[PDB]
Design a protein around this ligand. Sequence first.
Ligand SMILES: [Cl-]
Ligand SMILES: [Cl-]
Ligand SMILES: [Cl-]
Ligand SMILES: [Cl-]
Ligand SMILES: [Cl-]
Ligand SMILES: [Cl-]
Lengths: 174, 174, 174, 174, 174, 174
Amino acid sequence: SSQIRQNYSTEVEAAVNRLVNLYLRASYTYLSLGFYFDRDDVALEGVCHFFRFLAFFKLFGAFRLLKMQNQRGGRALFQDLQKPSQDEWGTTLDAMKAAIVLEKSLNQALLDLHALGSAQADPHLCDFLESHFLDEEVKLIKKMGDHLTNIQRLVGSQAGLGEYLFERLTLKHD
Amino acid sequence: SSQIRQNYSTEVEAAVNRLVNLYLRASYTYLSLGFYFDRDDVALEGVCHFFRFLAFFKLFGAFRLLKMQNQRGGRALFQDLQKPSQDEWGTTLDAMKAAIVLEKSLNQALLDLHALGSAQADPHLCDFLESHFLDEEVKLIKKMGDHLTNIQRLVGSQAGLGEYLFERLTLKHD
Amino acid sequence: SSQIRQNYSTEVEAAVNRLVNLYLRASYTYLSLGFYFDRDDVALEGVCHFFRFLAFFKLFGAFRLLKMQNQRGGRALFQDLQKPSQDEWGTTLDAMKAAIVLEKSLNQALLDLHALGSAQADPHLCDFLESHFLDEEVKLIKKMGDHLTNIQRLVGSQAGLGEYLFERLTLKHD
Amino acid sequence: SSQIRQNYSTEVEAAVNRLVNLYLRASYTYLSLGFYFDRDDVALEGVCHFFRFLAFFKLFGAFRLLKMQNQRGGRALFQDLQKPSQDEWGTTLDAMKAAIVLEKSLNQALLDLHALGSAQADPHLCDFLESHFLDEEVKLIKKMGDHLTNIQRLVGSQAGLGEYLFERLTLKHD
Amino acid sequence: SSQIRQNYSTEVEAAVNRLVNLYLRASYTYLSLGFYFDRDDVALEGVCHFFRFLAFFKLFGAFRLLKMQNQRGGRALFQDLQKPSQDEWGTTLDAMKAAIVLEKSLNQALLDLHALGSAQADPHLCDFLESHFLDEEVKLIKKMGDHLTNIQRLVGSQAGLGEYLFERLTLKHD
Amino acid sequence: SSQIRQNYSTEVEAAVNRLVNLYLRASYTYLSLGFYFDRDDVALEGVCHFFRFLAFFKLFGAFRLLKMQNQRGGRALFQDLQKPSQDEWGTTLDAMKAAIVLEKSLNQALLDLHALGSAQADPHLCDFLESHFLDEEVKLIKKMGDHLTNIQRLVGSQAGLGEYLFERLTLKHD
Ligand SMILES: [Cl-]
Ligand SMILES: [Cl-]
Ligand SMILES: [Cl-]
Ligand SMILES: [Cl-]
Ligand SMILES: [Cl-]
Ligand SMILES: [Cl-]
């Protein structure tokens, strides 16, 4: 058996591998969102940059989970990565709504893994999630909600104007 | 009796304590305004920051009054602090109108205390208000009036657009 | 309903608002303690400065709770703030005893909210309290206990001398 | 139709999307290789670092292809990403042999796309591959070959010793 | 009774004192390991330095526990410290195996104390262990496991050569 | 036999190991003294810091003896470490008296080992003690005596006042 593994259940080990898959899927979704907004017929640079940053952020989350798996003596196992749910992502509003749905799904997965760790009396797992994931996720969802509200406020009956303004005046661009 | 107190009436001492209560109430109102605009379903960061700054500014006014009370040999007495008049503050326009009403009420209290000090031939009190409160208050009310006019100009028939623009282009934010 | 709220019970939301009230009440108590020790007939600058710092520290705790409430998608609700329990605070010893009673009450409220969050399987709440409140509170209570012991040691039968010495040689002043 | 697209065939557009998939698959393979060598029961840090760097390098190649797709007015389309060919990667020698097989497959795909672009008289495509991919790939394969030879030289009849030495003295580590 | 103690059970207080004893025993074990590898007839400086660093690290853990005991209002109680389990520690491999056994025993003690704190609804205790001990322990055990694997790889049939190489090329020395 | 050992008797080797035990016991005593003075119900920071520094100083003495044992080709042997003589240490005066008794016992052990080395014509041993231990010990005992006199002077009939003053004005603290 493993020479380091201690207090690390097979259930947690498997759920960690599933969570890695979810984060890599999310990263891939954000890559697709970013390149959609980079299209010449969409052309919203600040939106492209927002989602490209999230793609990297989710990849980093996957890396941290994988590092932790090895630190605990579990075995990282990779599965196929499903493609994103859409090929074209509609408006900034559509995209931000899809992103918050995605993040709520990741958050629920975090909460489920935390509950499993608590049930298994695995405090290292619980602390790892609390310290590196739960607050970052709450912060991100709050940000997305703030953005949704500002996007929604700007729709009015001049949708194109509002979409431009949001990208120019809220999102970070050159 | 007090070893330092000189030319400091009981009427002024009491009115100073009442004024502290008014400034702390105002500070609390601004705390509530700030956190309303921080809500994910309101999300106007520059508005949040404007009112949070005013919360601190009013707290500082209360501190100065309390310092002065002690310098004069009066006794600081604290009363319960009433909660703010609203739990939800409507639009930026609604909020800025409530703020200017609040400030006019504080200004009238300043003017009333100055008149009491003048009647009591308390020039230190009168100078203290003139030097640290009256002009700061006039400056703040002017600023708020300038803001009200710009907000009103932006309502038109695209209210959400104007509310965004004001927050982005007039108020200070990240 | 809220677009961000997830795993955030009404019970926790209410208890957070109650806790904000408790921290603001504590802040107000410390404001009163500070200005008492600033009186010309009390005149213990290091004691004034100790309690003024705590007033700010408790205000900051309230701010953090309110920020968290919004991050979670709860609604900040403010209530009236009761005045402090005393108008005059006796000796440094009396004041430090009142402060430790106050802090033990805040600590119990923290522990109660943590237990509620644990019962509700709200790990973000539990981590927030652990990371920003519980240890800070334990550290503060320990400090106060250290101070109480030194004050008590100095009473002897030369109380005024000991009260001066403590203020001069332990507490931070100009 | 597209407002920018010019001299950009559907065949090239599709082959670019396929190539993105191949690079992302390669990146994923290298992520798996890296975490295998990070296991406590493998523990070859320089090998872990070599493959983690390649994972990032292949991701960057995919990003460049996607940027180019948009610059040309094609549509980035993402497909499912197959998991890597192995869950456990054997020795450093096994791993480096798998890596060179992978890279030769990527190189052939590059050469095939270049031939398609040449047949289609698409010089921008051909120059893009020549300038950003072909030489980088030749350089990488040469490096891997150099490594294979040194690993092979070190097998002898003291395989563990040689595997350690290679990791310590050729590969970059802390 | 104690003037600060709150929510701090006698069971936790005792278990903290036992844990201090375990950490000091571990520190003493590492002192002995370090001086064994410093012998002229062993002479593995990097091994000496590894274990001397761990001796200090475990002493620091004991200090932190003792600081916490006082912060909580418990009473630090010291017991006799048993000598280390061996006078001579064999090979680097033998020593590293003894060290990982020691660390797994310390980790189990940490986990047991965390479970007691959880049962006692002592979140400060649980957070203290999570924040300052559990991850540091997992990190250390992983490191030791990595070392064991590299040592084992180097045994082959040239044990002395491999032991030298490990000390020279993995462990930190002058 | 040992390849380096020369002019190093078994008697000296054993006495060196006994002396290490005495220094580690002294270090442990000082750890206990330090944490006693850190208690919230004792709270004499300068006293805590004095004894914590001595704990480290005695540990360093043990390290030097162990280094020397190996340099001479003797074998370091560790025994159980007895717990300190008291769980609670009374007043600063009580504690400083216990410390000087402890140091006189260590000094006598140094003098006894020096006499053994002289009898055995072991000048390296004698020089080692003279150069690194004897004067440091005389200096420390003198310091402790100076402290005892100042503590005793301050008892008078206001013991608590004097104990505070000594800690504040002689001992080093924040
Ligand atoms: Cl498959
Ligand atoms: Cl009342
Ligand atoms: Cl009310
Ligand atoms: Cl599909
Ligand atoms: Cl005993
Ligand atoms: Cl024994």
